[PDB]
């Protein structure tokens, strides 16, 4: 079966909310036993728009990760209904509720591929992963590594971003009781983003180093691409130059200051003498 | 005593200044808020 | 009856609200409808958890769309998942009619009422979901016997009791002759918010990014040239302006806003470009190094 | 009294504002009338709601319910465009 | 609703302990929990002048716009403020200036509860345009 019609995967805010909400609805499982559900969305496009998700009851044990239940029958019956809603809604792939992928996920993937025409395994997390994306999208690939590993079926990442639809986007604002200090439209928002940026870089940066250690000892298989990309980052380095700002901002501001002060200087004598007569008047006026 | 010496004059000022401070504090908060 | 029919202030969750707006939008002018899954507590609280939709048609809402087969079919799926939900009511979208309940829409609401005594009817406006204001209302049917004896303010008791006016015209007139409209509240949860607020891993480096000198230079050139033009104006302006009231000074110096303010606006735009570049310039070099 | 005020409100809301103008060419006694709506395309309406067959008069302007056209009634008369200029 | 509103009542007369409660309730999910988080500090302090409480109620309401929290926040100030009735309009005038029925709703209420006994002229006057308005 094809996994083809993807080069990008955008995911709606609807997708995430549906999984936390659905956890209570089914059984109040709460990621005690990981859930896999259908991932619904558009087709006949290069880009993948994941419009929607619904849960399927799938419990995978915590004794063992090779045993699971996946409710097949629900998938065929839910199929006919999707057209009643809209004819752009078809089964694109499946969702994993995290916290992480498994080797076991290849086997879960073969069953789901029969239904889909463009299966993808997108891990939508029940916990939001950081302030970054709470979603990572992956696609099943047959590849060899020059680590002395013959043919494996594994998950290589494909770029994930968050998108929205015209109907949905409006609805999100109304619902929200946050105002956004992280809007990123203007200078005020932009300065916050820079502080956070540094913190983001640090969180990402640690992982890269532990991965390098694992290969060294605490043996882990080398994904060749990762090592190739790492070395590239260090070589571009140059040193800094210039950039500065003018005295001009102040000049304008001072201009405003003169105008008021001149108006004040004529007004002063008038305003200050009169005060005593009005003051007396006020106290008596107040009583009645 | 109860006529009005200098200590009674002390009590008067004290009383007003103290009472008045908590209310001035709410106004100080408004500037910050 | 006036002695047990009260209005149902509907708490609408993110999963229902978004679903309904999207479904209507794509179909237009084909109208979509469906049953709403939720739970009923109080004698007036309905939380609308989630929705699924019924058959779209090119005449829109009709009797033909409503069959017990679709509903019955759904309920079997509800058991299998182990979701409990009973039916709270039904929804529809009218791009082709106003908020007033069309003659076929009342027929459809009566059938749905036989199944769940407490039934709600919702107009969605998919068209309005394109703009930044969205107007949607929920309603509840009122009985003919109820009107004469009770009168429509009986639905208003022991609940929120906000009665909606969706402009004048057909919408208001149809409201009055047909149903009682009741308000919308949004259910929210902290977790639900947190999902929405989330951005990107990539934005972390985005700010950091050292803005090209080239682009900066384009901005710098653009800023000094406007400034020079305005500078003159500024120079004439200061000879006068002995009086307060800055708007009057704007007519005098010519145009909306003072020329002093125009120069500052430009100085500030440059300042913003400069702020990202210079901060970024040192910051980048040190951290990777 | 207060009473006619309420009769007006009650009649305006049932009647449906805006009323779309028609011209009443002739009345059929079975609860229909043949109206030409002044918007641009003519309609074969019912005579129902606040008017009688005899209450309608030929060559006059009439009120139609905007939502679904039935002829609500004749308050107003229609003068020709021609006659206005000619007349002194 | 019955229980969120009850938490305030039990907590009566401990004063400072209540401070802890407003923040935690707000941290919990639904808007209902957050609402009655505003009532606890106010009931507890009952006619004692406390700077910290008024600041928090005000900041929560402005910072995060939610219908339940903004109405509840304003209403609470009238109880802390109860002991002296004249001070109250000057604080409350700023909330009345904000265009939003829920914010207006509490701002009006706050004046009635505080001024209830010994009143003041200004308090009464502020209420009248809101009465006159078409927003119910």
């Amino acid at each position: 079966m094809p996994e083809l019609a993807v080069q990008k995967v955008v995911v709606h805010p609807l997708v995430l909310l549906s999984v936390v909400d659905h956890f209570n609805r089914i059984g109040k499982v709460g990621n005690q036993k990981r859930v896999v559900g259908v991932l619904l969305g558009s087709w006949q496009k290069k880009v993948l728009d994941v419009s929607n998700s619904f849960a399927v009851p799938f419990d995978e044990d915590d004794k063992d990760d090779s045993v699971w239940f996946l409710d097949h029958d629900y998938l065929e019956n839910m199929y006919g209904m999707f057209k009643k809603v809209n004819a752009r809604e078809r089964i694109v792939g499946w969702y994993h509720t995290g916290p992480k992928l498994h080797k076991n996920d290849i086997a879960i993937n073969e069953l789901m591929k029969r239904y889909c025409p463009n299966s993808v395994l997108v891990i939508i997390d029940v916990k939001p992963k950081d302030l970054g994306l709470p979603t990572e999208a992956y696609i099943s690939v047959e590849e060899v590594h020059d680590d002395g590993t013959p043919t494996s079926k594994t998950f290589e990442h494909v770029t994930s971003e968050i998108g929205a639809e015209e109907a949905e986007e409006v609805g999100v604002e109304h619902l929200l009781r946050d105002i956004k200090d992280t809007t990123v439209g203007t200078l005020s928002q932009r300065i916050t983003n820079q502080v956070h940026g540094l913190k983001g870089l640090n969180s990402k940066l640690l992982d890269i180093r532990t991965y390098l250690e694992k290969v060294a000892s605490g043996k882990l298989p080398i994904n060749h691409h990762i090592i190739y990309q790492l070395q590239d980052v260090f070589n571009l380095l140059p040193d800094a130059s210039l950039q500065e700002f003018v005295k001009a901002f102040y000049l304008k501001t001072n201009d405003q200051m003169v105008v008021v002060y001149l108006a004040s200087l004529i007004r002063s004598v008038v305003a200050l003498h009169n005060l005593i007569n009005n003051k007396i008047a006020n106290r008596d006026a107040e009583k009645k | 005593s109860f006529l009005g010496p200098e200590p009674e004059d002390l009590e008067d000022l004290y009383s007003r200044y103290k009472k008045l401070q908590q209310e001035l504090e709410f106004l100080e908060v408004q500037e910050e808020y | 009856a006036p002695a047990v029919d009260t209005a149902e202030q509907v708490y609408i969750s993110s999963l229902a609200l978004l679903k309904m707006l999207k479904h209507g939008r794509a179909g237009v002018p084909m109208e979509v409808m469906g049953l709403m899954l939720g739970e009923f507590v109080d004698d007036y609280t309905v939380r609308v958890i989630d929705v699924f939709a019924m058959p779209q048609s090119g005449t829109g809402v009709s009797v033909e769309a409503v069959d017990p087969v679709f509903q019955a079919k759904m309920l079997d799926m509800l058991k299998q998942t182990g979701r409990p939900e009973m039916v709270v009511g039904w929804y529809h979208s009218h791009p082709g009619f106003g908020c007033w309940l069309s003659g076929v829409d009342i027929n459809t609401q009566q059938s749905f009422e036989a199944l769940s005594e407490r039934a709600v009817a919702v107009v969605v406006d998919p068209i309005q979901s394109v703009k930044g204001k969205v107007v949607i209302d929920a309603f509840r049917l009122i009985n003919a016997n109820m009107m004469v004896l009770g009168h429509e303010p009986r639905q208003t008791t022991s609940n929120l009791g906000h009665l909606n006016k969706p402009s004048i015209q057909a919408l208001i007139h149809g409201l009055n002759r047909h149903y009682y409209s009741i308000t919308i509240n949004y259910r929210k949860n902290e977790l639900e918010q947190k999902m929405l607020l989330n951005l990107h891993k990539k934005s972390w480096m985005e700010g950091l990014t050292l803005q090209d000198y080239s682009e900066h230079c384009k901005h710098n050139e653009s800023v000094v040239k406007e400034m020079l033009e305005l500078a003159k104006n500024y120079n004439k302006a200061v000879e006068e302006e002995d009086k307060m009231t800055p708007e009057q000074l704007a007519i005098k110096n010519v145009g909306k806003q003072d020329p002093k303010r125009h120069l500052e606006e430009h100085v500030d735009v440059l300042m913003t470009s400069n702020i990202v570049q210079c901060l970024a310039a040192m910051l980048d070099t040190v951290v990777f190094k | 009294e207060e009473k006619q005020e309420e009769e007006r409100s009650k009649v305006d809301d049932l009647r449906g504002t805006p009323m779309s103008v028609g011209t009443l060419e002739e009345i059929i006694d079975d609860n229909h009338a043949i109206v030409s709506t002044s918007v641009g395309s003519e309609h074969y309406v019912s005579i129902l709601s606040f008017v009688d067959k005899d209450l309608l008069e030929p060559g006059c302007s009439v009120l139609l319910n905007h939502k679904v056209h039935a002829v609500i009634g004749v308050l107003m008369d229609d003068t020709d465009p021609l006659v206005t200029v000619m007349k002194v | 609703r019955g229980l969120a509103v009850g938490i305030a009542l039990v907590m009566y007369g401990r004063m400072e302990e209540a401070d802890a409660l407003i923040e935690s309730l707000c941290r919990d999910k639904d808007p209902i929990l957050r609402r009655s988080g505003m009532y606890t500090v106010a009931m507890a302090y009952c006619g004692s002048g406390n700077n910290k409480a008024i600041r928090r109620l005000l900041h929560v309401a402005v910072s995060d716009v939610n219908d339940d929290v903004r109405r509840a926040a304003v209403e609470s100030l009238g109880f802390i403020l109860f002991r002296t009735p004249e001070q109250c309009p000057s604080v409350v005038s700023l909330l009345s200036e904000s265009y939003n029925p829920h914010v207006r709703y509490g701002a009006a209420m706050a004046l009635g509860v505080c001024c209830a006994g010994t009143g003041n002229k200004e308090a009464i006057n502020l209420l009248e345009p809101m009465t006159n308005d078409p927003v119910n």
Side-chain angles (χ1 to χ4, degrees), chain E residues 25-116:
Chain E
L25 265 159
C26 289
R27 288 320 84 221
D28 300 294
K29 49 276 178 296
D30 293 303
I32 301 189
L33 285 312
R34 309 196 67 191
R35 191 174 169 81
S36 306
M38 306 293 119
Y39 294 155
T40 62
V41 48
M43 279 300 295
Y45 265 87
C46 52
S48 176
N50 183 38
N51 288 115
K52 290 168 68 271
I54 76 176
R55 292 218 69 191
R56 279 183 270 135
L57 281 163
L58 288 161
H59 306 323
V60 167
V62 178
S63 296
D64 34 268
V65 195
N66 185 34
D67 298 304
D68 286 90
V69 323
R70 297 208 63 159
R71 180 164 294 176
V74 198
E75 291 175 318
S76 304
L77 290 168
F79 302 91
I80 337 200
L81 306 164
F82 211 166
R83 173 45 65 78
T84 298
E86 279 69 48
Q87 65 186 3
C88 63
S90 307
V91 178
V92 170
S93 282
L94 281 59
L95 300 138
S96 301
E97 193 52 8
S98 186
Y99 290 79
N100 191 58
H102 300 54
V103 194
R104 276 185 186 257
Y105 197 110
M109 193 75 191
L111 309 183
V113 64
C114 194
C115 306

Side-chain angles (χ1 to χ4, degrees), chain C:
Chain C
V4 70
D5 290 11
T6 49
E8 299 170 274
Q9 45 165 289
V10 64
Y11 261 74
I12 192 166
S13 43
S14 196
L15 291 63
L17 169 57
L18 312 173
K19 283 189 167 61
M20 282 173 185
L21 291 181
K22 77 179 190 172
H23 308 332
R25 237 305 299 147
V28 76
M30 309 182 83
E31 310 182 341
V32 62
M33 45 183 296
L35 287 309
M36 303 199 294
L37 294 166
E39 310 277 61
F40 180 21
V41 280
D42 304 83
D43 284 297
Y44 55 83
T45 313
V46 158
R47 301 184 174 216
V48 181
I49 298 203
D50 195 47
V51 296
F52 69 99
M54 269 200 154
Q56 316 176 37
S57 299
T59 57
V61 180
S62 285
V63 293
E64 81 182 341
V66 184
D67 295 307
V69 319
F70 289 138
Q71 288 178 237
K73 175 170 169 72
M74 186 64 186
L75 191 62
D76 186 289
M77 314 313 150
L78 293 185
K79 303 295 180 57
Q80 188 168 32
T81 61
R83 291 166 174 182
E85 283 79 59
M86 44 71 78
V87 182
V88 293
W90 68 305
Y91 92 102
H92 36 101
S93 59
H94 288 155
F97 304 85
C99 296
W100 63 273
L101 288 196
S102 315
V104 269
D105 210 289
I106 54 157
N107 284 332
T108 45
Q109 186 146 2
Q110 293 178 256
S111 38
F112 295 136
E113 193 163 305
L115 288 315
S116 289
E117 297 297 308
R118 300 290 286 211
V120 170
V122 185
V123 283
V124 166
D125 288 67
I127 48 177
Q128 298 292 346
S129 72
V130 185
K131 298 63 168 284
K133 192 44 192 179
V134 190
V135 294
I136 56 155
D137 294 79
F139 314 124
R140 176 182 165 77
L141 194 45
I142 56 195
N143 181 62
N145 187 267
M146 194 206 79
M147 273 312 296
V148 67
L149 168 69
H151 315 276
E152 207 166 304
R154 296 267 60 246
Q155 297 276 102
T156 306
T157 212
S158 276
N159 56 72
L160 221 307
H162 205 287
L163 168 60
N164 298 285
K165 274 62 159 180
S167 310
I168 332 181
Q169 238 181 72
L171 302 69
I172 206 193
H173 291 324
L175 186 159
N176 308 330
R177 311 170 199 173
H178 309 161
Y179 53 81
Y180 175 70
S181 50
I182 177 66
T183 197
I184 314 192
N185 291 328
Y186 297 114
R187 186 169 73 180
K188 307 169 199 193
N189 301 299
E190 204 57 70
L191 290 292
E192 168 186 314
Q193 308 300 294
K194 194 78 187 57
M195 299 306 206
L196 298 157
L197 274 181
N198 303 158
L199 295 174
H200 294 114
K201 278 162 88 170
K202 324 191 194 303
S203 55
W204 291 332
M205 313 299 294
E206 187 178 81
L208 312 186
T209 303
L210 173 57
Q211 175 183 317
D212 297 282
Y213 188 61
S214 312
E215 213 278 337
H216 183 75
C217 183
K218 187 177 48 156
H219 205 268
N220 205 7
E221 288 161 13
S222 179
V223 168
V224 303
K225 58 169 159 59
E226 292 286 295
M227 280 170 76
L228 185 62
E229 307 181 64
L230 300 158
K232 306 292 190 298
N233 200 1
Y234 179 43
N235 195 259
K236 288 169 228 309
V238 289
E239 307 298 279
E240 59 171 278
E241 301 191 310
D242 294 311
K243 44 293 184 183
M244 223 164 65
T245 67
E247 185 70 277
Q248 185 172 269
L249 313 180
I251 321 192
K252 290 300 200 314
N253 309 330
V254 179
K256 184 189 182 74
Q257 302 181 116
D258 306 290
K260 26 180 173 160
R261 203 175 293 156
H262 284 138
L263 273 139
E264 194 168 272
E265 183 183 76
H266 304 136
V267 171
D268 286 1
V269 297
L270 189 265
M271 194 174 99
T272 301
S273 294
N274 189 73
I275 288 294
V276 173
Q277 190 176 18
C278 70
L279 166 65
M282 182 76 186
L283 184 66
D284 291 348
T285 64
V286 61
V287 297
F288 292 72
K289 186 169 46 182

